[PDB]
Design a binder for this molecule. Structure first.
Ligand SMILES: [Mg+2]
Ligand SMILES: [Mg+2]
Ligand SMILES: [Mg+2]
Ligand SMILES: [Mg+2]
Ligand SMILES: [Mg+2]
Ligand SMILES: [Mg+2]
Ligand SMILES: [Mg+2]
Ligand SMILES: [Mg+2]
Ligand SMILES: [Mg+2]
Ligand SMILES: [Mg+2]
Ligand SMILES: [Mg+2]
Ligand SMILES: [Mg+2]
Ligand SMILES: [Mg+2]
Ligand SMILES: [Mg+2]
Ligand SMILES: [Mg+2]
Ligand SMILES: [Mg+2]
Ligand SMILES: [Mg+2]
Ligand SMILES: [Mg+2]
Ligand SMILES: [Mg+2]
Ligand SMILES: [Mg+2]
Ligand SMILES: [Mg+2]
Ligand SMILES: [Mg+2]
Ligand SMILES: [Mg+2]
Ligand SMILES: [Mg+2]
Ligand SMILES: [Mg+2]
Ligand SMILES: [Mg+2]
Ligand SMILES: [Mg+2]
Ligand SMILES: [Mg+2]
Ligand SMILES: [Mg+2]
Ligand SMILES: [Mg+2]
Ligand SMILES: [Mg+2]
Ligand SMILES: [Mg+2]
Ligand SMILES: [Mg+2]
Ligand SMILES: [Mg+2]
Ligand SMILES: [Mg+2]
Ligand SMILES: [Mg+2]
Ligand SMILES: [Mg+2]
Ligand SMILES: [Mg+2]
Lengths: 167, 111, 127, 51, 185
RNA sequence: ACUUGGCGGAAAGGCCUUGGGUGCUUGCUGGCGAAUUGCAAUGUCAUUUUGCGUGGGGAUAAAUCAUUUGUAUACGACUUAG
RNA sequence: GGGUUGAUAUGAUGCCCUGACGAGUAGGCAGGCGUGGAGGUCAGUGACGAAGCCUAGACCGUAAGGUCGGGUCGAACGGCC
RNA sequence: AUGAAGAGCUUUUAGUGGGCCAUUUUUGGUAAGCAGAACUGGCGAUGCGGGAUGAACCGAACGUAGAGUUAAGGUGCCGGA
RNA sequence: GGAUGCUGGCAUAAUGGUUAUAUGCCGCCCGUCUUGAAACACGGACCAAGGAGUCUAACGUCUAUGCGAGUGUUUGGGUGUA
RNA sequence: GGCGAGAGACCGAUAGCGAACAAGUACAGUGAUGGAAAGAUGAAAAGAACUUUGAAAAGAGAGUGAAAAAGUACGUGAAAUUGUUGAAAGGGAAGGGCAUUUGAUCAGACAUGGUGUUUUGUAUUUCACUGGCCAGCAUCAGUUUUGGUGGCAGGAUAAAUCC
């Protein structure tokens, strides 16, 4: 024999985890995030774009829209820690947002075999966008320069001090 | 050493945050009144509060309670010592000696 | 397939090398304690090499485990391998260095049949 | 296996002391005192203000 | 750091796990540490400690010593326990009907105790007959009777047997032992 | 991007100006588009040099060794000549 | 300082719980690593390549050191008590 | 009164038997980084932060790591503030 | 009386290891006598191999074993697979 | 000691007798005396016929051999030390430690049991996922840091201000 043996072998039966005491209870969003509030996106494809907050979803996310006709941001799901909530406010009374949920955004995950060589849209989502944005632009048209404020993009300038700024 | 006259607040905070008993020559965190009832129930003491009482209202069994209490292991003061130089008397601008009622502030910073 | 284990921690992945194994060829790299009266390494002056001590010891839960999570067991034949039949999730076989190529085939076939992991299934393979 | 500190963790606070529940109910950390109409004598004040 | 009052990491100073590699003694230890752990009897702890002892701390116990011990009051029907060996003694001519528990018996001791109508017993049979030490009587033998102890504490005015191979006249009976030759110690 | 006329030598290598051409203009009002980077991943936008290619111009040497000299010289070097 | 022989499985010098502690020349003690040979065993490895040598190639160990892969080599050699 | 970290007891044996520094007390000496004593604490045998640099001074004594707070000493730049 | 849930990307040298290099800070030559060594104190140019508390007679303390008021077969004899 | 035998927990060519070999040899010293170093091709010389360059030694080929990485400088063929190639760095040394970058190089896990037959070789399989590396969010726990804010007490029941 090259190596003799261990006289005792450890058990291969796996031990079970103790009962944990970490219950899931909901988020306490900060007081500056109210539906209708205008947000600035800080990360992602649409970083620097101003957008409208509509609904707090179940997976600690915010439902969000450009509206798409204004700046090009569709009905989307974002995270609260990657946005700045401004003081500017819109009224969302008149938008039937109850339809949207975590299942509305499902990726239909990709398989192992499908490797992209070098490099589509759902009509339901397109039409729901056209339904919501028409009710939103009707209220954005009231306050002046707001359609422009949303079509524009946010940027920090020389001298901007975010600890001093107000959004 | 630095010494002085402690208040109920700092006695209570010490015994509740850094509260350790000498059970069979071991440093046991108190964490419950059963330990105290088992090791001091002889001397009428049942709770961490009755212990604090025997401490502050210096009783017949202060010796036994204070010996049961393991020496308090305090950190350094979170805001500092207040002086630039420690090893003069509190009177001469240092830290040692009797700081009669200013010991509560230091101990709370250290606990 | 390995048994679940924690993250493996080492605390010193660098080999403890003898003082002046870089300076003299006669001085080998195998650790020797400096026993000198004026040794900076023995006295532990700032900026010197580290000395091995028991605080660098590895956790007893993750000791002797390879990164796969198996403990290595040397084997020279199928009978030595079969001791790990009911211990596949804990122990992995290492074929000894002095084993011939034609017997390595047998050991690897039996290990594949019994589900035993082999750390060196490439020694003495021709193609 | 772990020392939880009272003065936070109200649960351990109440495990150690059951009086902590009614202490907060009555706000005994903010007890008001009965007003009194006592005034010091003239000798105290004149000795204090003396040179 | 700590200003230490005691010596750190000091062994108790007491033997555990007898360093004899005798498996039967190890089995007796396995039994008696269990009994000391679960019986609440001091006898088990005494016997367990005694089983750890060295040979010179396990001196032989004479049957005449056992007879003395049984000539006590209320000790005639007791069980004598010797953690060690029992030796014979021809200086006695009567021996009672006692039972004796011991590790080892010499042939003469066994024969005397049996011929007197008694029985010779092991410490494992003692465990089933008396798990808490019922009606027992532990006997230890003499320790300072040894030869080495004669020389322990050698010095002036102690009277403590110098270490010497050949005895007689002209071996350490001169200057330092009589006033005629210098001084007496 | 062209074009006119100036000024600038401390390291100017930049500053100003003329004329028209061309593009954009968020000064104002509108229309269309963006989505799928899937809840973030710098999410790639700069300048530094070099090389290989195409196509459009431009110009057609010297130094060293060797020989020689002695205003030089340990040797190199230096100074000369051919 | 303590707990734990209960049948069924493996190690009671075992496993587990609890608390404290950790500087070190001369020096002491303990547990281990490695070398030549001896008894035993693995019905151990081996010309389908032993031992040795080289290897900013890999793994284990706090370390002593051990293991593997590749190259070279050619006849013996190791693990455990 | 306070504390006890277990109290007491024995056997055997190693190294050592050149010392040095600081505060204070003090002898000789003009004095000495001189010679010699007393008490303690240290270096020797001891790394660490500070005193630019230093065996002994200040602070603090060391298993391997993480986070926080500080000692002495510092916060124009070298240099953390 | 000790962290669980949801989600995404990658599933490979990407994290990580090793190694060389660069950068910031630290880092005096080992061994040795010595109160004190980096020393303007001594040995050491380099490499391989060899190289230094052993055995014995008599003892001591301790430990283990065997027998035990006894103990020690082995000077010798008998026998032997010598 | 001599002759003849048998053994070894002995040494294994810097060991073991000084001497495993043409060793008390070569050699030194007037002399008495002193006194080494030095073993291993391969199973077998089959020890390289022959061509070619060269004055030749040799080389390059060819050939023998299981192997010329065995060629009488011959088993294996370490290190110091050196040559060539490749890689990298380098302003009065080099080397080391902690940490990361950059370059080079490298191990490990990526099957898993599993609904399941959209199945071929008809029972092999048809198979969506499974577990590793790196992160983000929420809700908690332990240790801590930095802020905002509320209710109370005390003192000459602040002193003052104000009347
Ligand atoms: Mg601070
Ligand atoms: Mg300070
Ligand atoms: Mg070296
Ligand atoms: Mg020293
Ligand atoms: Mg704990
Ligand atoms: Mg410590
Ligand atoms: Mg124990
Ligand atoms: Mg030592
Ligand atoms: Mg080989
Ligand atoms: Mg190398
Ligand atoms: Mg051969
Ligand atoms: Mg002595
Ligand atoms: Mg002496
Ligand atoms: Mg010394
Ligand atoms: Mg010190
Ligand atoms: Mg001081
Ligand atoms: Mg820190
Ligand atoms: Mg600074
Ligand atoms: Mg890498
Ligand atoms: Mg990396
Ligand atoms: Mg790297
Ligand atoms: Mg390097
Ligand atoms: Mg330096
Ligand atoms: Mg000197
Ligand atoms: Mg000098
Ligand atoms: Mg000299
Ligand atoms: Mg000398
Ligand atoms: Mg020299
Ligand atoms: Mg050697
Ligand atoms: Mg006799
Ligand atoms: Mg005889
Ligand atoms: Mg060969
Ligand atoms: Mg060869
Ligand atoms: Mg050769
Ligand atoms: Mg070399
Ligand atoms: Mg928290
Ligand atoms: Mg907080
Ligand atoms: Mg008030």
């Amino acid at each position: 024999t090259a190596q003799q043996a261990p006289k005792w072998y450890p058990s291969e039966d796996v031990a079970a985890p103790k009962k944990t005491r970490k219950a899931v209870r909901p988020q306490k969003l900060r007081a500056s995030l109210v539906p209708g509030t205008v947000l600035i996106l800080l990360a992602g494809r649409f970083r620097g774009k101003r957008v409208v907050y509509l609904k707090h979803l179940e997976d600690n996310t915010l439902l969000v829209t450009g509206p798409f006709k204004v700046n090009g941001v569709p009905l989307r799901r974002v995270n609260a820690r990657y946005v700045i909530a401004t003081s500017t406010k819109v009224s969302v009374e008149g938008v039937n947002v109850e339809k949207f949920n975590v299942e509305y955004f499902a990726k239909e995950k990709l398989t192992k075999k499908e490797k992209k060589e070098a490099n589509e849209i759902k009509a339901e989502r397109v039409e729901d966008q056209k339904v919501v944005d028409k009710a939103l632009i009707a209220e954005i048209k009231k306050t002046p320069l707001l359609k422009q404020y949303l079509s524009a993009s946010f940027s920090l300038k020389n001298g901007d001090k975010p600890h001093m700024l107000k959004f | 050493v630095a010494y002085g006259y402690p208040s109920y607040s700092t006695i209570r905070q010490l015994v509740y945050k850094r509260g350790f008993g000498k059970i069979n020559k071991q440093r046991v965190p108190l964490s419950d009144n059963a330990i105290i009832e088992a090791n001091l129930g002889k001397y009428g003491i049942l709770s961490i509060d009755d212990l604090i009482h025997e401490i502050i209202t210096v009783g017949p069994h202060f010796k036994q309670a204070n010996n049961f209490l393991w020496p308090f292991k305090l950190s350094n003061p979170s805001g500092g010592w207040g002086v630039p130089r420690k090893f003069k008397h509190f009177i001469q601008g240092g830290s040692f000696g009797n700081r009669e009622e200013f010991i509560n502030k230091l101990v709370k910073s250290m606990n | 397939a390995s048994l679940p284990h924690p993250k493996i921690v080492k605390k010193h992945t660098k080999k403890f090398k003898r003082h002046h194994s870089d300076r003299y060829h006669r001085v080998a790299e195998n650790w020797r304690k400096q026993k000198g009266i004026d040794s900076v390494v023995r006295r532990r002056f700032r900026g010197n090499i580290s000395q091995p001590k028991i605080g660098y010891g590895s956790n007893k839960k993750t000791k002797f485990l390879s990164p796969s999570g198996h403990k290595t067991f040397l084997v020279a034949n199928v009978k030595d391998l079969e001791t790990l039949t009911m211990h596949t999730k804990t122990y992995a076989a290492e074929i000894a260095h002095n084993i011939s190529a034609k017997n390595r085939v047998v050991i690897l076939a039996r290990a594949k049949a019994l589900g035993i992991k082999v750390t060196n299934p490439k020694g003495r393979l021709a193609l | 296996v772990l020392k939880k500190n009272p003065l936070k963790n109200k649960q351990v606070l109440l495990r150690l002391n059951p009086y902590a529940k009614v202490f907060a109910a009555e706000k005994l950390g903010s007890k008001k005192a009965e007003k009194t109409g006592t005034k010091p004598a003239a000798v105290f004040t004149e000795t204090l203000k003396h040179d | 750091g700590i200003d230490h009052t005691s010596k750190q990491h000091k062994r108790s100073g007491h033997r555990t796990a007898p360093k004899s590699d005798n498996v039967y003694l190890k089995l007796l230890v396995k039994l008696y540490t269990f009994l000391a752990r679960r019986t609440d009897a001091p006898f088990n702890k005494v016997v367990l400690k005694a089983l750890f002892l060295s040979k010179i701390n396990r001196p032989p116990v004479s049957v005449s010593r056992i007879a003395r011990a049984l000539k006590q009051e209320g000790a005639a029907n007791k069980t004598v326990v010797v953690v060690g060996t029992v030796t014979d003694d021809a200086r006695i001519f009567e021996f009672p009907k006692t039972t004796v528990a011991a590790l080892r018996f010499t042939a003469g001791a066994r024969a005397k105790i049996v011929k007197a109508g008694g029985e010779c017993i092991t410490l494992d049979q003692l465990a089933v007959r008396a798990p808490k030490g019922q009606n027992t009587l532990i006997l230890r033998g003499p320790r300072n009777s040894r030869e080495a102890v004669r020389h322990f504490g050698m010095g002036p005015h102690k009277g403590k047997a110098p270490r010497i191979l050949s005895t007689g006249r002209k071996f350490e009976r001169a200057r330092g032992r009589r006033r005629s030759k210098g001084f007496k110690v």
